[PDB]
Amino acid sequence: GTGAALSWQAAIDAARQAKLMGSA
Amino acid sequence: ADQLTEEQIAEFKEAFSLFDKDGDGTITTKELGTVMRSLGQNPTEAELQDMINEVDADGNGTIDFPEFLTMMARKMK
Ligand SMILES: [Ca+2]
Ligand SMILES: [Ca+2]
Protein backbone atom coordinates (compact mmCIF):
# COMPACT_ATOMS: atom_id res chain seq x y z
CA GLY A 1 0.00 0.00 0.00
CA THR A 2 1.57 3.27 1.16
CA GLY A 3 5.27 3.74 1.97
CA ALA A 4 6.53 5.89 -0.90
CA ALA A 5 5.82 9.21 0.86
CA LEU A 6 7.36 7.95 4.09
CA SER A 7 10.53 6.91 2.29
CA TRP A 8 10.77 10.32 0.64
CA GLN A 9 10.18 12.19 3.90
CA ALA A 10 12.48 9.89 5.89
CA ALA A 11 15.35 10.45 3.45
CA ILE A 12 14.86 14.22 3.55
CA ASP A 13 14.80 14.27 7.35
CA ALA A 14 17.96 12.17 7.58
CA ALA A 15 19.61 14.15 4.79
CA ARG A 16 19.06 17.42 6.62
CA GLN A 17 20.16 15.81 9.88
CA ALA A 18 23.57 15.14 8.35
CA LYS A 19 23.61 18.65 6.88
CA LEU A 20 23.06 20.26 10.27
CA MET A 21 25.71 18.07 11.91
CA GLY A 22 28.17 18.72 9.07
CA SER A 23 29.49 15.15 9.12
CA ALA A 24 31.29 13.62 6.14
CA ALA B 1 3.48 23.29 5.89
CA ASP B 2 0.24 23.45 3.93
CA GLN B 3 0.72 27.17 3.23
CA LEU B 4 3.52 28.08 0.80
CA THR B 5 6.31 30.50 1.73
CA GLU B 6 9.95 31.46 1.11
CA GLU B 7 11.20 28.67 3.34
CA GLN B 8 9.23 26.07 1.36
CA ILE B 9 10.71 26.89 -2.04
CA ALA B 10 14.20 27.23 -0.59
CA GLU B 11 13.60 23.95 1.22
CA PHE B 12 12.81 22.10 -2.01
CA LYS B 13 15.90 23.51 -3.71
CA GLU B 14 18.13 22.55 -0.78
CA ALA B 15 16.81 18.99 -0.63
CA PHE B 16 17.03 18.75 -4.41
CA SER B 17 20.63 19.93 -4.45
CA LEU B 18 21.49 17.32 -1.83
CA PHE B 19 20.09 14.44 -3.88
CA ASP B 20 21.53 15.50 -7.24
CA LYS B 21 24.98 14.09 -6.43
CA ASP B 22 26.21 14.07 -10.01
CA GLY B 23 24.84 17.61 -10.12
CA ASP B 24 23.28 17.14 -13.57
CA GLY B 25 20.13 19.04 -12.55
CA THR B 26 18.11 15.86 -11.98
CA ILE B 27 17.84 13.10 -9.37
CA THR B 28 18.31 9.41 -10.18
CA THR B 29 17.63 6.10 -8.45
CA LYS B 30 21.35 5.57 -7.92
CA GLU B 31 21.86 9.14 -6.72
CA LEU B 32 19.11 8.96 -4.10
CA GLY B 33 19.76 5.31 -3.35
CA THR B 34 23.30 6.26 -2.40
CA VAL B 35 22.05 9.04 -0.13
CA MET B 36 19.57 6.66 1.47
CA ARG B 37 22.28 4.05 2.08
CA SER B 38 25.01 6.44 3.26
CA LEU B 39 22.52 7.71 5.82
CA GLY B 40 22.13 4.14 7.13
CA GLN B 41 18.43 3.93 6.27
CA ASN B 42 16.42 1.36 4.29
CA PRO B 43 18.86 0.82 1.33
CA THR B 44 15.96 -0.68 -0.61
CA GLU B 45 17.17 0.85 -3.87
CA ALA B 46 14.59 -1.44 -5.46
CA GLU B 47 11.60 0.24 -3.83
CA LEU B 48 12.77 3.62 -5.10
CA GLN B 49 13.56 2.36 -8.60
CA ASP B 50 9.95 1.20 -8.74
CA MET B 51 8.52 4.38 -7.20
CA ILE B 52 10.53 6.68 -9.47
CA ASN B 53 9.55 4.62 -12.50
CA GLU B 54 6.01 5.77 -11.67
CA VAL B 55 6.27 9.46 -10.74
CA ASP B 56 8.81 9.91 -13.55
CA ALA B 57 7.04 12.42 -15.81
CA ASP B 58 9.30 11.95 -18.86
CA GLY B 59 9.94 8.30 -18.00
CA ASN B 60 13.67 9.03 -18.07
CA GLY B 61 13.98 7.36 -14.68
CA THR B 62 14.82 10.66 -12.98
CA ILE B 63 12.97 13.17 -10.79
CA ASP B 64 12.92 16.80 -11.91
CA PHE B 65 12.82 19.92 -9.71
CA PRO B 66 8.96 20.38 -9.92
CA GLU B 67 8.10 16.75 -9.15
CA PHE B 68 10.16 16.71 -5.97
CA LEU B 69 8.75 20.08 -4.92
CA THR B 70 5.29 18.58 -5.48
CA MET B 71 5.42 14.99 -4.17
CA MET B 72 6.92 16.55 -1.04
CA ALA B 73 4.05 19.03 -0.60
CA ARG B 74 1.43 16.29 -0.77
CA LYS B 75 0.92 15.98 3.01
CA MET B 76 2.92 16.51 6.20
CA LYS B 77 0.96 19.37 7.77
CA1 LIG C 1 20.62 12.85 -12.45
CA1 LIG D 1 11.05 13.09 -15.20
mmCIF file of C-alpha atoms and ligand atoms in Angstrom:
data_model
loop_
_atom_site.group_PDB
_atom_site.id
_atom_site.type_symbol
_atom_site.label_atom_id
_atom_site.label_comp_id
_atom_site.label_asym_id
_atom_site.label_seq_id
_atom_site.Cartn_x
_atom_site.Cartn_y
_atom_site.Cartn_z
ATOM 1 C CA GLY A 1 0.000 0.000 0.000
ATOM 2 C CA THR A 2 1.574 3.266 1.162
ATOM 3 C CA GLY A 3 5.265 3.741 1.967
ATOM 4 C CA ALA A 4 6.526 5.893 -0.901
ATOM 5 C CA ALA A 5 5.817 9.205 0.857
ATOM 6 C CA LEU A 6 7.361 7.950 4.093
ATOM 7 C CA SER A 7 10.530 6.911 2.285
ATOM 8 C CA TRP A 8 10.770 10.318 0.637
ATOM 9 C CA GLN A 9 10.182 12.188 3.904
ATOM 10 C CA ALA A 10 12.479 9.888 5.888
ATOM 11 C CA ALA A 11 15.350 10.453 3.453
ATOM 12 C CA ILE A 12 14.863 14.224 3.551
ATOM 13 C CA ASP A 13 14.801 14.269 7.349
ATOM 14 C CA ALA A 14 17.961 12.166 7.585
ATOM 15 C CA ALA A 15 19.607 14.146 4.786
ATOM 16 C CA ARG A 16 19.060 17.415 6.623
ATOM 17 C CA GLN A 17 20.159 15.809 9.883
ATOM 18 C CA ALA A 18 23.566 15.140 8.347
ATOM 19 C CA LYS A 19 23.612 18.645 6.879
ATOM 20 C CA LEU A 20 23.060 20.257 10.272
ATOM 21 C CA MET A 21 25.706 18.066 11.909
ATOM 22 C CA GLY A 22 28.167 18.723 9.074
ATOM 23 C CA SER A 23 29.489 15.150 9.121
ATOM 24 C CA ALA A 24 31.290 13.619 6.137
ATOM 25 C CA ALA B 1 3.478 23.293 5.894
ATOM 26 C CA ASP B 2 0.245 23.447 3.934
ATOM 27 C CA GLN B 3 0.721 27.169 3.230
ATOM 28 C CA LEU B 4 3.515 28.083 0.798
ATOM 29 C CA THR B 5 6.313 30.497 1.730
ATOM 30 C CA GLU B 6 9.947 31.456 1.110
ATOM 31 C CA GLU B 7 11.204 28.666 3.338
ATOM 32 C CA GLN B 8 9.228 26.071 1.364
ATOM 33 C CA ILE B 9 10.711 26.887 -2.041
ATOM 34 C CA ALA B 10 14.201 27.230 -0.587
ATOM 35 C CA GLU B 11 13.597 23.949 1.219
ATOM 36 C CA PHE B 12 12.810 22.098 -2.010
ATOM 37 C CA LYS B 13 15.904 23.515 -3.705
ATOM 38 C CA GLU B 14 18.129 22.551 -0.780
ATOM 39 C CA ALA B 15 16.805 18.994 -0.626
ATOM 40 C CA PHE B 16 17.029 18.753 -4.406
ATOM 41 C CA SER B 17 20.634 19.935 -4.452
ATOM 42 C CA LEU B 18 21.486 17.316 -1.830
ATOM 43 C CA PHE B 19 20.085 14.438 -3.883
ATOM 44 C CA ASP B 20 21.529 15.499 -7.240
ATOM 45 C CA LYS B 21 24.981 14.093 -6.426
ATOM 46 C CA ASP B 22 26.209 14.073 -10.013
ATOM 47 C CA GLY B 23 24.836 17.607 -10.117
ATOM 48 C CA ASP B 24 23.284 17.141 -13.574
ATOM 49 C CA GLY B 25 20.129 19.044 -12.548
ATOM 50 C CA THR B 26 18.106 15.862 -11.982
ATOM 51 C CA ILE B 27 17.837 13.102 -9.374
ATOM 52 C CA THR B 28 18.308 9.405 -10.185
ATOM 53 C CA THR B 29 17.632 6.100 -8.452
ATOM 54 C CA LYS B 30 21.352 5.571 -7.916
ATOM 55 C CA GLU B 31 21.864 9.143 -6.716
ATOM 56 C CA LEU B 32 19.115 8.962 -4.102
ATOM 57 C CA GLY B 33 19.764 5.307 -3.351
ATOM 58 C CA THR B 34 23.303 6.259 -2.403
ATOM 59 C CA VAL B 35 22.053 9.042 -0.132
ATOM 60 C CA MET B 36 19.566 6.665 1.472
ATOM 61 C CA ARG B 37 22.282 4.051 2.080
ATOM 62 C CA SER B 38 25.012 6.438 3.257
ATOM 63 C CA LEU B 39 22.515 7.707 5.824
ATOM 64 C CA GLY B 40 22.126 4.145 7.132
ATOM 65 C CA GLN B 41 18.429 3.932 6.270
ATOM 66 C CA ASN B 42 16.425 1.361 4.285
ATOM 67 C CA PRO B 43 18.859 0.824 1.326
ATOM 68 C CA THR B 44 15.956 -0.683 -0.613
ATOM 69 C CA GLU B 45 17.169 0.850 -3.874
ATOM 70 C CA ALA B 46 14.590 -1.441 -5.459
ATOM 71 C CA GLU B 47 11.599 0.236 -3.829
ATOM 72 C CA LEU B 48 12.766 3.617 -5.098
ATOM 73 C CA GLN B 49 13.556 2.356 -8.599
ATOM 74 C CA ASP B 50 9.948 1.198 -8.740
ATOM 75 C CA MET B 51 8.517 4.378 -7.197
ATOM 76 C CA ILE B 52 10.529 6.678 -9.466
ATOM 77 C CA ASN B 53 9.553 4.615 -12.498
ATOM 78 C CA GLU B 54 6.006 5.770 -11.669
ATOM 79 C CA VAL B 55 6.268 9.463 -10.736
ATOM 80 C CA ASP B 56 8.808 9.908 -13.550
ATOM 81 C CA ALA B 57 7.038 12.416 -15.813
ATOM 82 C CA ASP B 58 9.297 11.948 -18.857
ATOM 83 C CA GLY B 59 9.940 8.298 -18.002
ATOM 84 C CA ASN B 60 13.666 9.031 -18.074
ATOM 85 C CA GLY B 61 13.981 7.360 -14.684
ATOM 86 C CA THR B 62 14.824 10.665 -12.982
ATOM 87 C CA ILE B 63 12.967 13.175 -10.787
ATOM 88 C CA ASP B 64 12.923 16.802 -11.908
ATOM 89 C CA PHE B 65 12.819 19.916 -9.710
ATOM 90 C CA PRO B 66 8.962 20.375 -9.916
ATOM 91 C CA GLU B 67 8.102 16.748 -9.153
ATOM 92 C CA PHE B 68 10.162 16.714 -5.975
ATOM 93 C CA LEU B 69 8.747 20.077 -4.922
ATOM 94 C CA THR B 70 5.294 18.576 -5.477
ATOM 95 C CA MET B 71 5.424 14.993 -4.170
ATOM 96 C CA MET B 72 6.924 16.553 -1.035
ATOM 97 C CA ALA B 73 4.051 19.032 -0.599
ATOM 98 C CA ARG B 74 1.428 16.287 -0.768
ATOM 99 C CA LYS B 75 0.915 15.980 3.005
ATOM 100 C CA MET B 76 2.917 16.512 6.197
ATOM 101 C CA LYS B 77 0.962 19.373 7.767
HETATM 102 CA CA CA C 1 20.623 12.851 -12.449
HETATM 103 CA CA CA C 2 11.053 13.092 -15.200
#
